[PDB]
Structure formats: structure tokens, C-alpha cells
């Protein structure tokens, strides 16, 4: 069977809707499965809203050590690093890392707060040509993830575009690109999503999300130990909103477009 013939069965076992991206930076050829049609990012749009700060720090040296208050009121759920900051400081870089590393919903909030609102990251987004891409809600309401809303939702083939662009392209300058890079090559959340599909030591920078509806999602730079990188987004959702998570899905999709890679 082809790969697009894996694809359809595996979504078919799923008991859900999957969608893949994968684009092959050796020639731009790329692997397609519902690729224009719209998931709830979940955490995945963490990396859009640190690459816009990232994008203003271009233009202001003092950006990224700028203090920034982390009080009580702030705390949402799941805010591993933050609690440990409350009555405190913690830095615009700092925040980033919190916010892509440990997937910190507070990081997440300061980070849209200081950049004015959820649509001043879809307004990054727009310009680095992503017409796709929408922020509507801040921490926990963003991952609310129910079928057909339009929020806070991209496709897998924007968000792959994208994020070549940000981590090997052209959408940042040297010093930002690498500091974008670095955060998702330690990501502390994605060992058993992409990363398990994957040979074990290639290196991997990736951002995972998670929401209602089963929603559960990973978007990931690879870089073979002979080949090109490869670019690769892997979203999944299900119909009933409590439906459990299903990071395997995601391992096996990978899986399944890396071989022979």
C-alpha cells in the first residue's frame, strides 16, 4: 500500500480525524491528508505566540531580559514553571522557554498579554504569509478544540509551512531562529508523540498540544543523520469531548511518512 493508502487506514482505525503534513526540504515534495482542512491548534500555537516575541526582539536588544511579574492571578491550569515564579519575576525569554519546553499556559498568557491580544498573533502569523492561522482565545479557553469552530485553528499544511518558515526559513533572523530552535529541541513533552515514531537518535524539535474532543496534536523539525530535514505536522481529533488523548496515533502517522527517510 502507498503511503497515502497507510494514511487513509490508519485514519479509518482511528475512530477520528487525522490530519498530516510532512514536507521533505531535500526537494519540497510533500505528504498530504486533509493538509487544508482546520483542527484546534491546542498548544501548538505556543510557537506562534514566542516567535512573534522573538520577531519584536529583532528590533529591541532589551526585550528578551525584560522582567516580567508573575502574580497569583495569573496561575491558570497546568503551570509547571510559573508556580514555582509567583511573587516574582520572570524574563520575556524565560516565559518562551516555560511556554514551549513545559507547555506553561501562564508563559502562554503572559506572552499573548505582552504582545496585545490573541490577534496581535494572528497579525505575526499574516505576516509571515499564513492565511490560515487564527488565535481568538487566551489560557484554558483556547483548547476548548469542539468540531467546527473556527478558533484558534490552523490546517496542517499552514502550520508546516510555518513552522519551516520560522525554524529553517526565512521568517527570522539568525540570533531569533536559533533561539526558536533551541527551545524545541528541548521540549520536555513530546517523548511518546512524533519523537516515538521516530528512529531514536535522530534530533527532533517539536511542540505538542492537547484539548478537549481527544484533541492531540504535534508539530516537529527533524533532522536526519544523512538527510535534509524534514518538517511534520501531525494533528488529531475525535468526535466526543471527552474522548482520551492519543498521542500513539500521532507516533504512528510519523511512522508511517518517515520511512525510508
Given at each position: 500500500n502507498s503511503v497515502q493508502q497507510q494514511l487513509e487506514a490508519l485514519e479509518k482505525s482511528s475512530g477520528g480525524r487525522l490530519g498530516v503534513a510532512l514536507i521533505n526540504t531535500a526537494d519540497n515534495s510533500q505528504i498530504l491528508y486533509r493538509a487544508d482542512e482546520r483542527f484546534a491548534m491546542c498548544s501548538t500555537s505556543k510557537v506562534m505566540a514566542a516567535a512573534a516575541v522573538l520577531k519584536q526582539s529583532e528590533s529591541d536588544k532589551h526585550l528578551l531580559n525584560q522582567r516580567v511579574e508573575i502574580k497569583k492571578s495569573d496561575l491558570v491550569n497546568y503551570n509547571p514553571i510559573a508556580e514555582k515564579h509567583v511573587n516574582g519575576t520572570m524574563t520575556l525569554a524565560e516565559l518562551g522557554a516555560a511556554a514551549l519546553q513545559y507547555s506553561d499556559n501562564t508563559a502562554?498568557?503572559?506572552?499573548?498579554?505582552?504582545?496585545?491580544?490573541?490577534?496581535?498573533?494572528?497579525?505575526?502569523?499574516?505576516?509571515?504569509?499564513?492565511?490560515?492561522?487564527?488565535?481568538?482565545?487566551?489560557?484554558?479557553?483556547?483548547?476548548?478544540?469542539?468540531?467546527?469552530?473556527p478558533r484558534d485553528t490552523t490546517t496542517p499544511l499552514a502550520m508546516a509551512q510555518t513552522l519551516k518558515n520560522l525554524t529553517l526559513g526565512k521568517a527570522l533572523a539568525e540570533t531569533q531562529r536559533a533561539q526558536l530552535v533551541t527551545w524545541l529541541k528541548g521540549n520536555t513533552t513530546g517523548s511518546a508523540s512524533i519523537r516515538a515514531g521516530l528512529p531514536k537518535s535522530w534530533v527532533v524539535g517539536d511542540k505538542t498540544g492537547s484539548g478537549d474532543y481527544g484533541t492531540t496534536n504535534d508539530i516537529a523539525v527533524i533532522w536526519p543523520e544523512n538527510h535534509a530535514p524534514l518538517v511534520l505536522v501531525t494533528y488529531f481529533t475525535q468526535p466526543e469531548q471527552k474522548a482520551?488523548?492519543?498521542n500513539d496515533i500521532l507516533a504512528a502517522a510519523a511512522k508511517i511518512v518517515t520511512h525510508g527517510f
Open positions: 502562554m498568557n503572559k506572552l499573548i498579554a505582552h504582545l496585545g491580544g490573541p490577534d496581535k498573533v494572528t497579525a505575526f502569523a499574516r505576516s509571515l504569509g499564513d492565511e490560515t492561522f487564527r488565535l481568538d482565545r487566551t489560557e484554558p479557553t483556547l483548547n476548548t478544540a469542539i468540531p467546527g469552530d482520551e488523548n492519543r
